[PDB]
Structures are given as structure tokens and as C-alpha cells.
Amino acid sequence: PSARIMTFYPTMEEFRNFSRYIAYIESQGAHRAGLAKVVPPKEWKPRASYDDIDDLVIPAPIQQLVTGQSGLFTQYNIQKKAMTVREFRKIANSDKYCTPRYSEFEELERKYWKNLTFNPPIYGADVNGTLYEKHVDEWNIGRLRTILDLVEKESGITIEGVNTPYLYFGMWKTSFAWHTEDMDLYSINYLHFGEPKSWYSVPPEHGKRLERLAKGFFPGSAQSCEAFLRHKMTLISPLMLKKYGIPFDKVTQEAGEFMITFPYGYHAGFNHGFNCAESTNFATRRWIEYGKQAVLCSCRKDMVKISMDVFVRKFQPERYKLWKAGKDNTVIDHTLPTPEAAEFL
Ligand SMILES: CC(=O)Nc1ccc(O)c(-c2cc(C(=O)O)ccn2)c1
Ligand SMILES: [Mn+2]
Ligand SMILES: [Zn+2]
């Protein structure tokens, strides 16, 4: 109602059916913030121990160089040589790169935005893989069983990090820039272990305002691409958002907790120290209209585009002809929960 980030605490019985619970948190309005936390039942664990992954290879570690001032920044991601987790961790916990001393989140937050452009960190990002054991059937990021699977059930198409899992090994001050998901999908993020990850979110109903702000500050960027925020290079501080009246909220994700982003929910954030997160995209019936209307990067060829055709055919058959003819003028109402939420309404 205030479009603020909500947190949920499912029972183990509730935790069993992933799609149904997302339908439930949406019936509670969680999607309005564009971001929600889910704390799993105490009984649940995805892997017995994380002690046997020191030899896992991070194929393409990136150094995050950041340039900018007064709350506006551009981030250049520079690929470094491959690396084992053990090698990463020891860099991460080294004195040069480890978390500074701090009392409250607010202080660490100030330190992040103050030292953003100094001493570039390394982010072990976009590693193909899962840390779930094969037997875990609840909230398994490797096989969430949502209608996004249609991309690989009806079509034979695989998209790394999108319907397959990605691992993110973070250290202090590693960042994810402001962005929505590819095709404005949902995403799920599970923090396996380590120091926290802090998130900023803008409600989907005020997302355009964020985009107008960004276009204002980066007009050359705006001109050379229709959706340059999809480059995931743009950092904008909470003080800049507050100054220009963009509504937003912030939340800190601890180890063992899930974050869900919702369609067209802009988010950004940073890692507090050494940690590991797993994520992928997923969809619900509500996403389809977002997919249909998503504005994509127009300046790169290696970017993610999902043929919406099969989703329209299967879930909106009465609109298929109209859509295919270019006359579908459905307007998205960001406050409405996905259809599956009828059960709880
Ligand atoms: C390097 C890249 O393609 N960026 C990217 C693409 C899609 C995403 O969902 C995220 C992302 C990453 C995180 C994270 O690094 O923890 C959190 C939320 N979103 C980051
Ligand atoms: Mn994301
Ligand atoms: Zn582009």
C-alpha cells in the first residue's frame, strides 16, 4: 500500500509449492515494492555444508571500476583471469578488500557511497552452476518449475542465468547497477553463505520516473540505446533518488534468505563482504504482458530476447491474432496481483 518492501515467513508446508507461494505474497501486495524477502523455514537447508567448493572455478571474475560524482556513477566491468573460490575468498578477506569497521548498516551504507570509486573490487559474477544438492525439491533455483520453462519445454532454448542458475561470489563494495530483469521477468536470489547483500528498490509503478531521471543525466547514452539501463552500468545513490523525488525502499538480505524481484522492479545494491548468492529468472502468468511490452537493448546483438509468441499462444489464445497484428493495447496495471492469486482473494 505504501509500496514498501515486505518480508514473509512461510511454514514448511507453505514452502513446498514455489509458484503458489509467489501467488500468495502477491495477494498480500508484495509485488508493489518491486522486491520482497522470503525467510525459509528453519527445517530447510539447500546443501549440508559449503566446505567442499574451494576448488570451484570462477571462470570470468570482473574488476568493477567506477567513475562519477554527486551520486551518479558509471561502472565498467573488466574481466580478469579465472579463479578458484579459495583464491577469491582470500582476496576478499585480505586487509585491502575486506569490510571496513562499522556500527549500523547506515554507516556501512555511507562508506559504500563514499568509497565507491576507490580501490576497485572483484566480483565473481555470472558463474554457471548451482550449490543445491540434487535431492532438494523446495525452492530449487535450478528447477523452479514455472511457466518460464516453456522457453525450454516447447522451444529448445537455454539462456544462461535466465532459466539456468548463476552463482555470484561477492566481496565488500561489489555492486549490481540499477536494472530490471531481462524481458522484465521475475528473479529469485538466495544468499547461500557469507556477509550480507544490501538492496535498493523502486516500485514498478514509479519505474518510468527512474528511467526519465537516468535519461536526463545520460542523454548520449539515451540516444545510442532504447534501454541503456539494461547495460547494468549505471549507479545512482539513494540521496540522488530522494533529491529528485523518486520513491524507493532499501533492505538487507542475510545468509539463508531469499530475495524476489518482480516484473519491472528496478533494483540495485552491493555486498557487505565475502558471500555467495545463487539466482535465476522465473515467470508467472502476470509476467506475460510485461514480456510483451518490455523495451530491450537496441545497441547490442549478444543480449537476451525471448520470443513471446509461444506464451501468447498458450495463455492468451483469445488475444493472439490481435497481438500478432499489432493491435493489442493492453495497459499494465502494476498494482494487480498475478491471476493465480485468486485462490487467496
Ligand atoms: C553482470 C550482469 O549481467 N548483471 C546482472 C544481470 C541480471 C541480474 O538480475 C543482476 C543482479 C545481480 C544481483 C547480485 O549481484 O547479487 C542482484 C540482483 N540482480 C545482475
Ligand atoms: Mn537483478
Ligand atoms: Zn544497449
Taken in order of first residue, the domains within the chain and their CATH numbers are: 5-345 (2.60.120.650)
Residue 233, all three cell numbers: 552500468
Ligand 1 lined by 125 (C-beta under 6 Å) = yes
Atom 17 of ligand 1, nearest CA residue? 176
Is there a catalytic annotation at residue 267?
Answer: yes
Helix H or strand E encompassing 53: none
- Indicate the resolution in Å: 2.2
The whole-angstrom separation of Cα 120 and Cα 116 is 8
Q: Cβ distance 215 to 270 under 8 Å?
A: no
Question: Which residue, among 13, 58, 52, 12, has the nearest Cα to 133 in the 3D structure?
Answer: 52
Method: X-ray
Q: What is the CA radius of gyration of the chain?
A: 20
Counting Cα atoms < 13 Å in the Cβ hemisphere of 342 gives 4
Burial of residue 25 (CB within 10 Å: 0-12, 13-18, 19+) is buried
- Please tell me the distance between residue 182's alpha carbon and the centre of ligand 2 in angstroms: 9
**Inter-residue contact 19 to 285 (CB < 8 Å):** no
Q: Which of 172, 176, 195, 196 is nearest to 95 (CA)?
A: 172
Residue 168 appears among annotated catalytic residues: yes
**Nearest in space to 306 (alpha carbons), one of 147, 136, 183:** 183
Q: Around Cβ 315, how many Cβ atoms within 10 Å?
A: 15
Alpha-carbon span 49 to 165, nearest angstrom = 19
CA distance 332 to 212: 18
What's the angle, vertex CA 232, arms to CA 260 and CA 90, rounded to 5?
Answer: 80
List, in sequence order, the alpha helices (H) in the chain: 12-15, 18-27, 85-93, 105-115, 150-153, 207-217, 219-224, 238-243, 287-293, 309-315, 320-324
How far separated are the first and last CA of the chain, in Å rounded?
Answer: 16
Which of the listed residues 164, 168, 233, 279 should we mutate to test ligand 1's pocket, taking the one with most ligand atoms within 8 A of CB? 279
Q: Which residues are annotated as a binding site?
A: 123, 179, 181, 189, 197, 225, 231-232, 267, 297, 299
CA of 161, closest atom in ligand 1: 7
Hunting for cell 549500523 — which residue is that?
104
Query: For this structure, is 334 an active site residue?
Result: no
Q: Which of 278, 279, 291, 334 is catalytic?
A: 279
Q: DSSP character for 234?
A: E
The two beta strands, 35-38 and 6-8, are: parallel
Q: How far apart are CA 21 and CA 11, in angstroms?
A: 11
Can you tell me whether residue 265 is helix, strand or coil? coil
Q: Is the separation of the CB atoms in 337 and 31 below 8 Å?
A: yes
Report the C-alpha gap between 320 and 342 in whole angstroms. Answer: 24
CA distances (Å), origin 160, targets 13, 153, 165 = 31, 16, 7
CB 259 within 8 A of CB 188: yes
> E-strand spans in the chain?
6-8, 35-38, 57-58, 62-69, 72-79, 83-84, 122-128, 166-170, 175-179, 186-194, 197-202, 234-236, 249-253, 258-261, 266-271, 275-282
The owner of cell 538492496 is 199
Contact 193, 245 (CB under 8 A): no
